[PDB]
C-alpha cells in the first residue's frame, strides 16, 4: 500500500540522520570508507564481508533495510570486522578495538533513546507479510 511505502520512507530518513551523526564524528573517521586494498592487501583475505558506513548510506538509498534489526547487522559487522582483523595488544590495535565498540554502543545509544518501538514493531510485520 502508500501507506507502507510512506513508512519504509520515514525508515530511511531515519536511518541516514543516524548514519551521518556517526559519520561526523572525529573518532570514527577510520570507519567511514572501506578499509583501502592497495594500502592493505591482507585487509580481504582475512575479512570476508567489508563494510563501512559509506557503505551503509549506499544500501539504505537501495532499499536494502526494512527494518533497523538488519540495519544494526550491519552496524555490528562494522564493529565485528574491527575487532578480528586488529586483535592484538599493541597500542594501535587497542584504539581501533575501542573506537569499533564506541561506534557499536553510540548507534544503540541513539536508537533506544529515538526509535519508538511500535515503529520498528510495524516495519517488522509488513517485512513478513512481503
Ligand atoms: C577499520 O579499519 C581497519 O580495520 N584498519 C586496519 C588497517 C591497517 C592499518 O590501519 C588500517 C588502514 C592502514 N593503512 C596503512 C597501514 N596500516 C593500516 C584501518
Known amino acids: 500500500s502508500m501507506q507502507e ?3 519504509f520512507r520515514e525508515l530511511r530518513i531515519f536511518l541516514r540522520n543516524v548514519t551521518h551523526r556517526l559519520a561526523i564524528d572525529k573518532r ?9 586494498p592497495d594500502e592493505v592487501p591482507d585487509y580481504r583475505t582475512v575479512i570476508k ?5 559509506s ?7 537501495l532499499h ?19 575487532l578480528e582483523y586488529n586483535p592484538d ?13 564506541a561506534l ?3 548507534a544503540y545509544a541513539i536508537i533506544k533513546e529515538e526509535l519508538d ?3 520498528e514493531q510495524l516495519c517488522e510485520e509488513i517485512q513478513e507479510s512481503r
Open 5 to 7: 511505502e510512506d513508512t
Open 117 to 119: 518501538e511500535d515503529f
Open 49 to 53: 564481508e567489508p563494510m563501512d558506513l
Open 89 to 101: 595488544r599493541d597500542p594501535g590495535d587497542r584504539l581501533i578495538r575501542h573506537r569499533a565498540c
Open 55 to 61: 557503505s551503509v548510506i549506499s544500501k539504505i538509498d
Open 104 to 106: 557499536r554502543d553510540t
Open 28 to 36: 570514527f573517521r577510520v570507519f567511514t570508507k572501506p578499509v583501502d
Open 64 to 82: 536494502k533495510y526494512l527494518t533497523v534489526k538488519d540495519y544494526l547487522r550491519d552496524i555490528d559487522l562494522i564493529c565485528s570486522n574491527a
